[PDB]
Every structure is written in structure tokens, then in C-alpha cells.
Symmetry: C2
């Protein structure tokens, strides 16, 4: 059967085909070869754009204020080789075909992520209101859990034509997909996920506790409560494109994706000599953080770095999170329309924390000879840790444990606390769940934590779309299409997962980046090859519907 | 006409009458006079309770981990007398009768708060998408604003029987209020404010922009967007009890409320000698922060402070924000039912930042002879400052300007930034609005800022009730009623504005405190006088409806 992929629904362009086609993404007039384009941010969106623009014969100049990779960050533990904690993105749905294009291009290895109740996880434990349930398959759970699942399946089929939309995605039937999706847009933009859940037939006829347990742990594979306030359109996108199943981790860390793109030598670039990579073009490193972007008096865009160094470019791509164009960069107001500012400024970010330790061995696989149970499981709880994940690196390697992965309120619980207290709070919660398991005794190396909200170069883990934000996201996603733009707004571009329709998913950063590549190519008077048309060649036909004032 | 007051709707008890009645709040058996009751937190809820319990003949022992007054905090500027910035609560609706009972008791002076389009504000400026509107009265504003107001009035009357509910409040017609209110509870618990707005007839027939403007500035008297995700029941409570109009500030700072309660000598206490105040009972200061609460082997509650000192009490009231009973205090898990923990733990906190400067004089009242406009106005914008308030202390005193009062996303935009950058960001935004006004030149003293989310003794400005949180709030509000509780859960109490139905409003802290006074009196075998019945005497009859599982 044809795989589900992140194929629209908003802009069902085949990015994977565009990338794989042997003609390449297009071309730029030879007279513009070697011209510079500024790229703000060295995360996945900045680097994907830089890489493909280099291939088209431009000289991207990437600036990075903090760390290479942005929210793809894999921190090594003390003294180890190949043992990392994924601080940002960690579980990549195989529906992410644009992303996986680069993963494959680098020859990186992936393996199934130990999500609860999957073959990669031996066991799961749910702990709610002081009651603990062990499962090695879904059927092992109390009846309430299958009831929640059935009600969710049914609410999605009844309220979104889930099956029909997924079939259309499988077959890449664009006219059908748009018809279905475009029906849903004005009906669900303005409504929350919780409203979708509460007012569904399947859940309205169940107890409040079914809804509540759905929030805390779902049907035993993951909680939803942090996303309850979001526009249901966001959740539809996630489930319809299977963002929420068949996920892999990148072995050795996903940070190897941005780092590898930086160093990767394409077989063929336009203009550049053999052996050219982004790295070599920069002499090893991106430029420092950007402090200012303004229209210069020669018409170009002036980008000023932290040290006052000012350079001029025909085009500038920004990939930082949207608030940073006010908060961290002095970005001249007339460079975006007031409608674009409102979209960039009203956009909301979700908070997230993760706290990891390393352990001497995957001791959780040991059996409690009294009960038959693993000493420790993938843990979902209403306690402060919320989600605990177990990473097995082989019987003879240390294990890693994400003691707590938390979002929104539960992340904000940890905000002001240092790592020692984070870990202690988590161990004390996990001691309530597993009173007989000595986790502490196995812990080695250093403890690693993060709060994405705290960091001024991110002001959050990822966007979450509120009700009524469809029009904002539509403005942002379409910004790379500039033919109708006032001339004073042209030449600056945006990309990244906040521009995307699917914010907490790396595929959205990749796809928007590729749209910007097309926009920038076009800006330099370039164009796609006639046999491999690109995003902006079809955008007016199959792009996101616009809503009324 | 009889005033609107914060009279239910959930528990329409006449706290004001209770407080004012000459008999007093009740009594406790003489044998228990002088016994201690621990109070965690010296904000308004802890201090009200402590004050009323002292009057009944107990010895409250108040602990405070940080600053007296909690979220009633008035910081004096360098070198000045009587010139303060309100860092927490600042505008107290006159419908807050229990609160104003204590304000009057202390003889404190109040004056109308300079909200937009009131007599206390001379002018207001709205700045949206780069367009600026000046108004000295509502009619000065473009027609869109009156439309938004009409639609909101209409959505409230149509969807909530606002007029009826308000009449029932004016008349303190308890059966009618409850009938009207109880109808709304199951219908709106699970739905957001934005949903109520979008799906109203009045707004559904207006452009998206009408909704949007309503979020950003309302109808020209205040924005609603940070409250859009909350349960609509919360909002109903606000508007029905006039929390959102006729607001006063306390002259010299509202922190004079908690500080004067601490020092106030009642005419008559049971047991204590004349001249007794909370201060004199404590020898001048509350005890330090609490680190632990547990059941002791004598059957009392053990409270352990930061320095390891452990003291035992027949009753403990905690008034810190609910998360802190896991995050900051080791509070023995069996002291609360699991249902209670879940309420305490799931409760969500809103973020808030304010940044104030002092100016040499109220220069904003000067006229621009070219335009006839004030040099500066009460400012509502979509720019990052959001709301700017102007505080006139008289022509011959310095003025105070709250450069930016922001909530949620717009507060999170400032989170990691220091005060200098906060003030500069705000002055730059205000320069875009008022390009001809030199604010900087009038600024003297020190700048003052806060972010309530950042402080570990608060983990936010105040609760905001999410959809589906009615049951949690019902559990917490009712926790002072302990006759059916397991014995192990009795004797600990909670109060404060997160226990209340009206979280960002001081009256809710006062009303819950008073309930807990009742509970604690009852716990010590005391009771109200027959001619002045108290909260728990009528709670089972007029209390908040419970919802089904
Ligand atoms: C906690 C968490 C878990 C996640 N889990 C998943 C997952 O399981 N699966 C999945 O697919 N996706 C996941 N994601 C999302 C994925 O990681 C992102 O969508 C993607 O990494 C974002 O890429 P980006 O290039 O848009 O932005 P970023 O990586 O944010 O890149 C922007 C870069 O801009 C830089 N920058 C900022 N300001 C400046 C300045 N003034 N000058 C120069 N540079 C600047 C930043 O430092 C950063 O490096 C997760 C994200 C988080 C936060
Ligand atoms: C930014 C903001 C604006 C507001 N504006 C308004 C307004 O305009 N009008 C209005 O009516 N209301 C307003 N409020 C609400 C009002 O300020 C609150 O409702 C009220 O002050 C809350 O009082 P409380 O006693 O419940 O809690 P708190 O004031 O939080 O007091 C609890 C105390 O417990 C202490 N504590 C915490 N942990 C411990 C520990 N482990 N041991 C000992 N002590 C501890 C804290 O330090 C704190 O002093 C506002 C609040 C804020 C934050
Ligand atoms: N199970 C009830 C206690 C949960 C605890 N307050 C926590 O957040 O972990
Ligand atoms: N809404 C939960 C966050 C989604 C995130 N991409 C994750 O998979 O963890
Ligand atoms: N409306 C003009 C732009 C606003 C600017 N990004 C700000 O946050 O203030
Ligand atoms: N979040 C809106 C209410 C906040 C507060 N009571 C105020 O008037 O500022």
C-alpha cells in the first residue's frame, strides 16, 4: 500500500520528487553566480536552504548566534563516544520524506524510537491518580484505554473524514485532498482540540475521566493535554500525515544532520569547483549572530552582526523563531507589511523541558522474578515527570533515560530550577511509581537538562497554532511568493517550522526552507527546469486557501 | 440602584455581611485559646486568615519564604516618598467588597485607576497595524470599535443571560442567580472564550478583523487575547461581577494592605490582651520558608522550615500557588486525596511582565499645539508593549509610567531579558507610536520590572482556568469542608486566588481565605454565632454545583 507522507494537506507539493528528480532544482543566470545570500540561523531550515542555494551557484552566508543545528541538538555525555541526549527533536516520523532525503544523503543510520506499545519498547507503565498499570501490549491495559482509543478513532472519522483524507494522501490525489481539506479549514480554524474532543459524539457519551485520561496519556501511547488549546487544524495535520507514528531516532544523534549538511560535498554544483561544501565556502564556520537587518541605500539589504560588521546582500533568509525579529534583531519595520508583522508577532510558542541521565547498562530489561515485570518501563504518568523514555544502546553500552519530557504547564513547573533539583524531583516521582527500582544506583556521567522557553535565541520549543491563527500562518507560508509585493518588502524571506503548518515537526522546517529556496532562486532571476517544476510554479494553483476578512 | 458585587455566582455567600456583622465570625472553645495554627504564605490570603483567626483566640504562625504581601507588591523608586510601582495587583474593582473591607479597616485612600476611556484617563491611543487613533471619548474612535462593543454586549446577553444574572447579583437573589448560573456551567466549562466569541451570532457576522481587534484592544478599553484560551466560565465570572470596570488603585501602594493587616490592632480579640496584633504575636516577623509538611506521630501536622526547624500544629493553611506543594514543599502525599492532587497539579498559571519608569512630571498632559493631542496617552497596541499606563501623582510630583503590562506570549517575549533591554524595547515601540514625544528625556530614578513566571515562590502571575477545569476548581474550593474527609486528610487547608473561581482578582484570594477561616474554626470545635452564619454553614445548600463523572 502506498505510504502516508507529509503531503500537504495545505500545500500538497511533492518536495521529495522535486529533490530526487535528476534535473536539480533549477538554475540562476550565470551572471549572478557567486553572489551572496544571507541566511540567518544554522538550524535545519537555514542549512537546507544554504546547501541547495550553493548548488545553484550562489554563495550563501550563514549567520549563527548560538549553536550549530538549532533545535536539532545532540549533547554527548562526559567521557563517552556516541552516547547522546536529544535535547530538541528526537523521533522522526518516516512520513517526513523531505527530511529523510537529507538523512539518506548523509548515509546516517536510524532505528525505531522506543515509543510506548511498539516493538521498540518492551513494556509500558501508566501511573495515574496513584494507580499503576503494566503492559507489554495494548490488550494488557484496563478496558478504559481501548475505549479512549476507539472514541478517538471514531471522533476523527466522524469529524474529519480521516480515512478519505488519508487515502487521498496515499494516492497523492491533489484535487480530492484539497477538496476535503478545504472543507475543514473554515470549520476548525477557530476551534480547539479540546473542543473537538469534548463535542465529539464518541467522547460526549463517555465519562469526564475518559477525556482526562486521553489528555494525560492518550490511549496508552502518549498524552495530548498540552496540545488541547491548539487549533484543531494543527492536530488534524499531525494525525492525517502520521506524524504521530512509525518514528525513528538518528543513531549517534540527529545533530549529525545539520553538521553533515554543513560539511557535505555535492557531486555537482553550478559554478563552484569540486570539493566545495558550505563549510569550505565559509572557511569553516558560519558568521556570528545578527543584530540588525535594514534596507541599504544601494537597494540591497544590510545585515549587521554582533560585532558591528555590516555586509550587503540581494537577499536575506531568516530562519530564527518569529519573535526574534523584534526581540533579538533590529529588523527594519518597512521590510515586512503590517499584516506580516501581525502574523510574526501573534504567533505563540510552546514551552518544553527534558532532563536526561546516563546509566551503566539497560538495567530496565531485567525481570523482577516475583512479578515477571521489567524493572522499569516507558513511563506515562500524571506525576510531574509526565513521560520517561528508555534508550537501549546494546547490552554492552550505557543506556540513556529521558527522566522527564514535559510540555507547557509541566515544563513551566521546572523553569526556574537547576539540573540537580530537576533530576531529584524526577527520581522522587519515579520512586513513587517504582518503589523497588534503584535508578540512582545505575546513574553515571553528568545530568543534562533544557528549557527552550528560557533561551533568548529561541523563545520556546516550537510554535503551537492557536484558534484563529490560520490566516497568520497563511500569510507567513505564502511570504516567499513576492510578485505582488511592494518592492520595499521584496528580497527578505522566512522559513522554519514556525512558518510551516506543522510546527513541532522537522519536516515543516524542511519544506518551508525549500519554498524559500524557490523564492530566492526566482529573486535572482532563476527558474526551475521545465521537467521538475518547483513550489512557486504551482503555488497559486494548489497552495493554501485564503480566508475572508 | 443596588451595586454589582463579587457575589458568587458559584458560591453566592455575603462575605461582606459576614465580616461586618457586629457579632464577629464566631468562636472557638476557650480551652483551645492560644493554640497555634500554621499559615504558609504572607500574601493577602494568609494574612486575612491569620488576622481573623487571631481575633477568634488562636495564635496563627505565618511563614513566608520570600516577601511579605506576595502578589500585592508596591516597589518604591530611588529616593522618593510615596512613589511606587505596582508589581502585582494594581486595579481593584469596587465590586471587591471583601477586599475593600480590609482597605477601609486600615483607613487607606484609593483613587480611580487610569483605565482607557474613563474620567481618570484624559485620552487614549490605539495603535494597530501601524495605524494610530487618538480618542478623548469612545465616539472619537472609528466605527469598527463601536461595532466590536455592540457585538460583545450582544454575545453576552444572547449567550449568557447577562442582564438577568446581573440583576440577580444586584438583588442578591440567590435562588435565581444559582438557577441561571448553574445552567451555564455544563454548557461552558469545556469551551474557550475565543469559541464563545467566534460562534456568537454578533461576531460570526463580522469580519475576522473585528474578532482580532477585540483580542488586541477590545473595544478600546482593553485586550482579551491572552484570556482567549481560558474556559468561558472564567470570563463570565469576570464580566458578570464587574471585575472589569470601576477599578481603584490604593494611594501609596496596595502593599499597604498586607503590611497594615500585619500591624493592625483589633478593638477586640478573644483571649489576647489589648494591643495585640499579628506582628506583636510573632515578635515582628513571620517565620521563614516552609520546606516540608507531614503528619506527625502525635496526630498533628509537622511543618519544617528552611533551616530544619520543625513545629507541630493542629491545623495548617497553605496559600502558596498550587504547584509549590510539589515543587517547593515536600508535602506528604497522603495529606491530600489523589483527586485533590490532580486538581492542584493540573492547574495552569499565566505569565505576566510589567516594566515601570518614573518621570519628572506628568508631561503627557501637555498639549501638542499643532494637533490638540496630549503628548502621550493611555496606549493600547499590537506592538510588544501592549498596554501603557500613565499615573499622575499631581502636577508637582513625579509621574509613573507603566511602559508595558503584558500577559502570556507578550510577557514570554521579555522572559530572559534584563531590565535595561526591556525598557529600551518599550521606548523604541513607543517612539514608533509617538515619534514626536521625548519620553526618555523625562525619565528619572530607577527602572522596575518583573516576570512572575520566573520566581520559584510563584510560578506565574495567577491561575487561568482552562476548558474542563471546573471539576478541579470545585474540588479545591470545597476542600475547607472536611466532614466527609478521611481523617488523614483533615486539618490541612488551602486558600488563595488559585483556589478561587476568579483567579486574577484579589477578591478571590480574600473569599477563599475566609472560607478556610471557617473550616479551621470548625476544626478547632468552634462555630459561628447563630445570628451570623458563615460559609460552611450554608455551603451544602448554595455551594458550587458538582458535575458528573
Ligand atoms: C523539545 C523539542 C522536541 C522536538 N521533537 C521533535 C520530534 O520528535 N520530531 C520532529 O520532527 N521534530 C521535532 N522538533 C522540531 C524540530 O526540531 C524543529 O522543527 C526544527 O529543528 C526547527 O528547525 P528550524 O531550522 O526552523 O529552526 P531552529 O533550529 O530554531 O534554527 C534557527 C537557528 O537560528 C539561530 N538564531 C536565532 N537568532 C539568531 C540571530 N540573531 N542571528 C543568527 N542566528 C540566530 C538559532 O540559534 C538557531 O540555531 C522538536 C523540537 C523541540 C524544541
Ligand atoms: C501581575 C498581576 C496583576 C494583578 N492584577 C490584579 C488587579 O488588577 N486586580 C486584582 O484584583 N487582582 C490582581 N492580581 C491578583 C492579586 O494580586 C492576587 O489575586 C493576590 O495578591 C493573591 O494573593 P494570595 O494570597 O492568593 O497569594 P500570594 O500573594 O501568592 O501569597 C502567597 C505567598 O506564599 C509565599 N510562599 C510561596 N512558597 C512558600 C513556602 N514554601 N513557604 C512559605 N511561604 C511561601 C509567597 O512568597 C507568597 O508571598 C494580580 C496579580 C498579578 C501577578
Ligand atoms: N499522584 C499525586 C501526587 C503528584 C505530585 N504532586 C506530582 O506532580 O508529581
Ligand atoms: N505535541 C507534542 C509535541 C510534538 C513533538 N514533535 C513530539 O513528538 O514530541
Ligand atoms: N506593528 C509593527 C511591528 C511591531 C513589532 N514587531 C513589535 O512587536 O512591536
Ligand atoms: N488576565 C486579565 C485579568 C488580569 C488582571 N486582573 C487585570 O485587570 O490586569
Amino acid at each position: 500500500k502506498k505510504p502516508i507522507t507529509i503531503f500537504g494537506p495545505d500545500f500538497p507539493f511533492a518536495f521529495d520528487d522535486w529533490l530526487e528528480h535528476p534535473a536539480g532544482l533549477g538554475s540562476i543566470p550565470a551572471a549572478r553566480h557567486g553572489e551572496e545570500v544571507a541566511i540567518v540561523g544554522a538550524g535545519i531550515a537555514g542549512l537546507v536552504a544554504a546547501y541547495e542555494l550553493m548548488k545553484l551557484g550562489l554563495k550563501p552566508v550563514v549567520y549563527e548566534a548560538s549553536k550549530m543545528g538549532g533545535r536539532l541538538r545532540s549533547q554527548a555525555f562526559n567521557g563517552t563516544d556516541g552516547i547522546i541526549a536529544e535535547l530538541g527533536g528526537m523521533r522522526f516520523p518516516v512520513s517526513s520524506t523531505a527530511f529523510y532525503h537529507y538523512v539518506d544523503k548523509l548515509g546516517l543510520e536510524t532505528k525505531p524510537f522506543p515509543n510506548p506499545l511498539t516493538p521498540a519498547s518492551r513494556s509500558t507503565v501508566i501511573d495515574l491518580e496513584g494507580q499503576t498499570y503494566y503492559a507489554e501490549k495494548a490488550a494488557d491495559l484496563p478496558a478504559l484505554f481501548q475505549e479512549v482509543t476507539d472514541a478517538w478513532a471514531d471522533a476523527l472519522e466522524s469529524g474529519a473524514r480521516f480515512g478519505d483524507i488519508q487515502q487521498a494522501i496515499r494516492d497523492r490525489d491533489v484535487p480530492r485532498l484539497k477538496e476535503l481539506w478545504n472543507t475543514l479549514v473554515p470549520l476548525w480554524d477557530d476551534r480547539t482540540f479540546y473542543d473537538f474532543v469534548a463535542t465529539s459524539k464518541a467522547f460526549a457519551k463517555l465519562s469526564f475521566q475518559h477525556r482526562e485520561v486521553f489528555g494525560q496519556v492518550g490511549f496508552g501511547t502518549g498524552g495530548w493535554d498540552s496540545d488541547f488549546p491548539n487549533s484543531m487544524l494543527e492536530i488534524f495535520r499531525v494525525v492525517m500525515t502520521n506524524c504521530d507514528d512509525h518514528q525513528h531516532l538518528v543513531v549517534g544523534g540527529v545533530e549529525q544532520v545539520p553538521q553533515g549538511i554543513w560539511r557535505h560535498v555535492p557531486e555537482r554544483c553550478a559554478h563552484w569547483p569540486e570539493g566545495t561544501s558550505l563549510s569550505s565556502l565559509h572557511g569553516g564556520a558560519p558568521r556570528t549572530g545578527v543584530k540588525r537587518i535594514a534596507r541599504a541605500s544601494d537597494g540591497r539589504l544590510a545585515v549587521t552582526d554582533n560585532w558591528g560588521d555590516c555586509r550587503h546582500y540581494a537577499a536575506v533568509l531568516t530562519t530564527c523563531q518569529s519573535w526574534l525579529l523584534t526581540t533579538q534583531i533590529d529588523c527594519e519595520e518597512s521590510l515586512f507589511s503590517q499584516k506580516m508583522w501581525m502574523a510574526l508577532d501573534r504567533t505563540r510558542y510552546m514551552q518544553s523541558s527534558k532532563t536526561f541521565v546516563m546509566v551503566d547498562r539497560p538495567f530496565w530489561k531485567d525481570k523482577d522474578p516475583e512479578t515477571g515485570r521489567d524493572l522499569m518501563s516507558m513511563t506515562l504518568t500524571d506525576r510531574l515527570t509526565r513521560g520517561t523514555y528508555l534508550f537501549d544502546n546494546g547490552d554492552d553500552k550505557p543506556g540513556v533515560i529521558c527522566l522527564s519530557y514535559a510540555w507547557m504547564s509541566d515544563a513551566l513547573k521546572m523553569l526556574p530550577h537547576p539540573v540537580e533539583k530537576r533530576v531529584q524531583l524526577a527520581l522522587d516521582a519515579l520512586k513513587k511509581i517504582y518503589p523497588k527500582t534503584d535508578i540512582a544506583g545505575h546513574i553515571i556521567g553528568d545530568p543534562i537538562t533544557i528549557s527552550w522557553e528560557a533561551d533568548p535565541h529561541f523563545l520556546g520549543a516550537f510554535k503551537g497554532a492557536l484558534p484563529g491563527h490560520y490566516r497568520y500562518n497563511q500569510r507567513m507560508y505564502a511570504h516567499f511568493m513576492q510578485a505582488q509585493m511592494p518592492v520595499e518588502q521584496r528580497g527578505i524571506f522566512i522559513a522554519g517550522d514556525d512558518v510551516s503548518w506543522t510546527p513541532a515537526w522537522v519536516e515543516g522546517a524542511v519544506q518551508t526552507s525549500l519554498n524559500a529556496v524557490w523564492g530566492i532562486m526566482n529573486h535572482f532571476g532563476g527558474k526551475t527546469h521545465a521537467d521538475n517544476p518547483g513550489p512557486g510554479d504551482v503555488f497559486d494553483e494548489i497552495g493554501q486557501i485564503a480566508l475572508a476578512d
